[PDB]
RNA sequence: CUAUCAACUUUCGACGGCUGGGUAUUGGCCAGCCGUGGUGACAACGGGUAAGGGUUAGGGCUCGGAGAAGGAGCCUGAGAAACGGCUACUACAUCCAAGGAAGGGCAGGCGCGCAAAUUACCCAAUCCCGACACGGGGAGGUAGUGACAAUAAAUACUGAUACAGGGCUCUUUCGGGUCUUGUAAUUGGAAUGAGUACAAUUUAAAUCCCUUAACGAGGAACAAUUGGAGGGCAAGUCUGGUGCCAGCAGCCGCGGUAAUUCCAGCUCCAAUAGCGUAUAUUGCUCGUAGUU
RNA sequence: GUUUUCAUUAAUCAGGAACGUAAACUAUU
């Protein structure tokens, strides 16, 4: 009987509200935005992502950058500059978000501001926390304590059990290629975006 | 690559030699009836610590078994093989005890010069010459013509010459090398033929305890004459 | 129920434990020992099982100091009480030996590492002090009551 | 036979038992207390450490989980310094072991009384 | 385990003996020749698929068929019908200058549009393989996460002074009982571990553990939670009605946001680093088989 | 009732067989 209770509770977790999809068979590139406080290296993460993806050493990558990642779907990266106008625009347009956190320095008003703006306008498809500046630690006890309390505060911010990756060093001015490889492993195989009513009623 | 517990329980390893245990290499003695040289050095004697240390010691010509230098790490040395170490100048011999475990004994050169080996069998070799097979897998050409199966031979170990022999005899003292009563030094009192396989001897101790061991496991040491220095 | 509530509160206050969780823990081990004594009384007298097991149990209880050395019978092993276990607790033993002014003073002393049991210091106050170990409870050698440095606030006042 | 053995060593055999000093059987600032068995095990472990003076790795996940499942399955408890055991197959072993180890003058007096007569007929 | 399995084998020879072939060797294992069998109610044969041994006080411990896209054939080697290779067919897939060429496994993520344990480090020890002390090891250990549990226990300890006279309780209530209780009062003491951290140690390198110098407590903080019960309020709002009553309630009031210091932190209950909620729940007579 | 016999022949009922306008106060004791 308890198997029936578990099955019923899983199905009652499975249900939703039936919203309209409106996605074409030739899907546009999904929007990956990179949002963080000033001086955390969202441009450097953009450089290292596009190098893992298309093997091109961009010296100064600006504006949207389109990359093909599967034979079926393709992404495009946009770093947000440090102005709240760009933050609100890209927040209301985003689909998957890489939220950068400056490690030892802890959370920042830019991060919490963007998180609340995002959740108020519309909770996008995927959000991942990336945590940098972990070479700037002297005791690994302090390192793992900061990692644990930042993961907990971030979970309480968005939801229980979000993905939070950690990027340790700055090797070639690029990133650890293994670190960004598992990051790209997470953001490669993708699902259809969450069908929000504003993006599915207006053309952008 | 067996586990430490599945290794035979009479060459001892404590609870800290890891989950593994070495297997003996191929050689004269049998697999179950062997003590490998690394276990003899670093587990029983503790003249070293590590596998690499034992590798270095065995690599330089420093450990001699049965009068010959042995190079490799896991050379088997099962039973009554003298182990001369010259930098300490000691000689070690492997006997059992009453419980049935390997026991090491210290000896000088006079008793270390010779070995006592049980005769496995005897035949005629190529050329029409009688040859003699010990349990040490040693073959002696041109033996004494009285040395039958299950005899014992005192061996020179320097020229391999047959120095002496001891006869299988009721009324002789023996040592057991197998069976459920393994390692019980006592006197042979009776032999039972049972023609058709697995003849038995009845062997009592020096102190009134009778038991039945088989001839294959029986290992004649001497009538009284304990030609090797048993530990006191 | 009000009876269980006021009883647990009386135990807590007169021996200033932290919570009824600790109270229920002592009640649980008391119940297990009392049950073992009950089974041994279910056996009959002069049976070797009851004789040896009951003698062992009484010797353990005496050697940890709960049962008095006068009475050594299984009826009194049944009459053993959680009040007796809490009297054997370490915190109440500091307060009774008189190193502390109050039971909570004993609790905070044991927390911030001033007393020792024998040779090593003791950080926990739910320690069950044995009768052989009771006499050696004193201030540690690194505590400002025992010696060592004059301490933190004394340092800041001397500066 | 454990209670039997402790009984022989404590009330029978004429030899003092080695009691450790009071502040040495404390593991981690009073969190637990080393019983006699774990104490002897620690001493054997330290003797192995000094035998060939090689350091030992502090216990791994396998052996730790094994002793954890053994304490989860066992019927012992460490209330104070002494160990308490359940009352089953140990007591039955005590019973089995105890059963197995259990497996010419009155003529002269009468003549003297008969020869002597009464002194008081009946008051 | 079963007769809702009593006949089975000779339907790939079933039982022999003789003769050879092949195999490392014996052998109906196979080819000739002839003989007549062999198994079974003491349970053959069939059917069901739910596929233990040793080490003995105990538990523990140890040991235990078919295939590498699919048939078929071949090759080396002490040991393989290796799936390692090749050969042809079939089924796929890739590059191209359209003449041609090479190739097939496991691990990870999603599997709703909504979710939760690393893509970690080294052969350092035990062990294995080599021309060989030195080379190489996907067993092995080291590390990281966890409120699913389970274990231990911080968030404060103790004085002095001044002032107020009530604090509490009940069966029986315009009624009883008991006597030291408080304060957003004023000052004094000491103790320190979370944390910060020079080092040294640990170790393959690190961490953890043990050592350990120096810092590190006054509430407006080094900032305890989750539920339940209950009181007090306006120049406010709403609703009922034989004036002022009653009820629902009440962040919302005239102004004022650098303005206010207000019940200044309302009171009580329970668990307390845990706790709460939902749901499931805990006509009569004879007569056969059958029965006594 | 007998100054009558046979000595378990017995009991029970699956299955089965023979007989066929209404209701409306209610081991003993
Ligand atoms: N050691 C260390 N340095 C980092 C790390 N991340 C970023 N940096 C340095 O910090 C700088 C941050 O630069 P960006 O990441 O480009 O800043 P941005 O927001 O992306 O672009 P800007 O608008 O120019 O600030 C980089 O140039 C790096 O040199 C890190 O994780 N570790
Ligand atoms: Mg940028």
């Amino acid at each position: 009987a308890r198997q029936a209770a578990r099955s019923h509770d899983i199905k009652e977790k499975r249900l939703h509200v039936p919203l309209v999809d409106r996605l074409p068979d030739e899907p546009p590139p999904r929007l990956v935005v990179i949002v963080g406080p000033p001086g955390v290296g969202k441009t450097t993460l953009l450089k290292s992502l596009v190098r893992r993806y298309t093997k091109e050493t961009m010296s100064d990558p600006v504006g949207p950058i389109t990359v093909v990642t599967s034979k079926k779907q393709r992404l495009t990266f946009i770093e947000c500059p440090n102005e709240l106008e760009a933050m609100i625009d890209m927040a209301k347009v985003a689909d998957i978000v890489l939220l950068m956190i400056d490690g030892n320095y802890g959370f920042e008003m830019e991060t919490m501001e963007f998180l609340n703006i995002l959740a108020n306008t519309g909770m996008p498809g995927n959000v991942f926390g990336i945590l940098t500046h972990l070479d700037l630690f002297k005791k690994p006890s302090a390192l793992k304590d900061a990692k644990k309390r930042l993961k907990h505060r971030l979970w309480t911010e968005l939801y229980q059990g979000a993905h939070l990756f950690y990027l340790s060093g700055v090797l070639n001015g690029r990133y650890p290629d293994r670190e960004i490889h598992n990051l790209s492993r997470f953001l490669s195989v993708m699902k259809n975006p969450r069908p929000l009513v504003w993006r599915n009623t207006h053309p952008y | 690559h067996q586990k430490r517990l599945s290794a035979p329980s009479h060459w001892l390893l404590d609870k800290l030699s890891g989950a593994y245990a070495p297997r003996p290499s191929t050689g004269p003695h049998k697999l179950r009836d062997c003590m490998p040289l690394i276990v003899f050095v670093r587990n029983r004697l503790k003249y070293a610590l590590n596998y690499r240390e034992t590798k270095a010691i065995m690599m330089q010509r420093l450990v001699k078994v049965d009068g010959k230098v042995r190079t490799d790490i896991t050379y088997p040395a099962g039973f009554m093989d003298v182990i001369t170490i010259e930098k300490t100048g000691e000689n070690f011999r492997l006997i059992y005890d009453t419980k049935g475990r390997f026991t090491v004994h210290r000896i000088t050169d006079e008793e270390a010069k010779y070995k006592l080996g049980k005769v496995k069998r005897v035949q005629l070799g190529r050329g029409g010459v009688p040859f003699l097979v010990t349990h040490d897998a040693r073959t002696i050409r041109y033996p004494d013509p009285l040395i039958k199966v299950n005899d014992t031979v005192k061996i020179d170990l320097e020229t391999g010459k047959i120095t002496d022999f001891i006869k299988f005899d009721t009324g002789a003292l023996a040592m057991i090398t197998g069976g459920r009563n393994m390692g019980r030094v006592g006197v042979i009192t009776h032999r039972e033929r049972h023609d058709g396989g697995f003849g038995i001897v009845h062997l009592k101790d020096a102190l009134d305890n009778t038991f039945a061991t088989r001839e294959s496991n029986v290992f004649v040491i001497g009538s009284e004459k304990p030609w090797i220095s048993l530990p006191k | 129920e009000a009876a269980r509530l006021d009883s647990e509160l009386k135990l807590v206050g007169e021996y200033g434990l932290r919570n009824k969780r600790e109270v229920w823990r002592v009640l649980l081990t008391l119940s297990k020992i009392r049950r073992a004594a009950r089974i041994l009384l279910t056996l009959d007298e002069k049976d070797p099982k009851r004789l040896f097991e009951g003698n062992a149990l009484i010797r353990r209880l005496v050697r940890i100091g709960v049962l008095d050395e006068s009475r050594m019978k299984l009826d009194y092993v049944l009459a053993l009480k959680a009040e007796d276990f809490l009297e054997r607790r370490l915190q109440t033993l500091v307060y009774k030996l008189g190193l502390a002014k109050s039971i909570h003073h004993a609790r905070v002393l044991i927390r911030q590492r001033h007393i020792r049991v024998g040779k090593q210091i003791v950080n926990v106050p739910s320690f069950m002090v044995r009768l052989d170990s009771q006499k050696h409870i004193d201030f540690a050698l690194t505590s400002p009551f025992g010696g060592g440095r004059p301490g933190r606030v004394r340092r800041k006042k001397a500066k | 036979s454990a209670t039997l053995d402790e009984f022989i060593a404590d009330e029978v055999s004429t030899a003092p038992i080695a009691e450790p000093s009071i502040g040495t059987n404390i593991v981690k600032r009073g969190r637990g207390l080393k019983t006699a068995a774990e104490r002897r095990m620690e001493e054997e472990r330290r003797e192995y450490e000094e035998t060939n003076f090689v350091r030992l790795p502090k216990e791994s996940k396998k052996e730790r989980a094994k002793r954890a499942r053994m304490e989860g399955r066992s019927g012992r408890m460490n209330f104070g310094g002494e160990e308490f055991r359940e009352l089953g197959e140990g007591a039955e072993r005590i019973s089995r072991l105890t059963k197995a180890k259990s497996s010419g003058e009155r003529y002269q007096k009468r003549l003297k009384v008969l020869e002597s007569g009464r002194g008081t007929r009946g008051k």
Side-chain angles (χ1 to χ4, degrees), chain A residues 48-55 57-58 61-71 74-84 86:
Chain A
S48 171
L49 274 168
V50 76
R51 178 158 147 108
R52 186 254 167 267
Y53 260 117
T54 189
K55 317 197 275 177
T57 55
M58 313 199 95
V62 301
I65 294 184
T66 299
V67 171
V68 51
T69 186
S70 86
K71 57 187 169 178
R74 59 190 186 270
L75 324 172
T76 186
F77 305 94
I78 295 180
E79 73 291 352
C80 277
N82 291 312
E83 289 191 353
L84 213 67

Side-chain angles (χ1 to χ4, degrees), chain A residues 37-44 82 132-136 167-170 175:
Chain A
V40 80
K42 58 209 177 304
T43 309
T44 306
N82 291 312
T132 71
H133 281 72
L134 289 186
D135 197 21
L136 272 299
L167 267 72
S168 42
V170 180
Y175 269 153

Side-chain angles (χ1 to χ4, degrees), chain C residues 106-119:
Chain C
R107 168 64 72 100
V108 62
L109 273 192
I110 300 181
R111 182 57 193 183
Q112 64 210 359
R113 309 208 195 93
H114 287 265
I115 73 164
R116 64 178 179 190
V117 169
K119 185 170 156 58

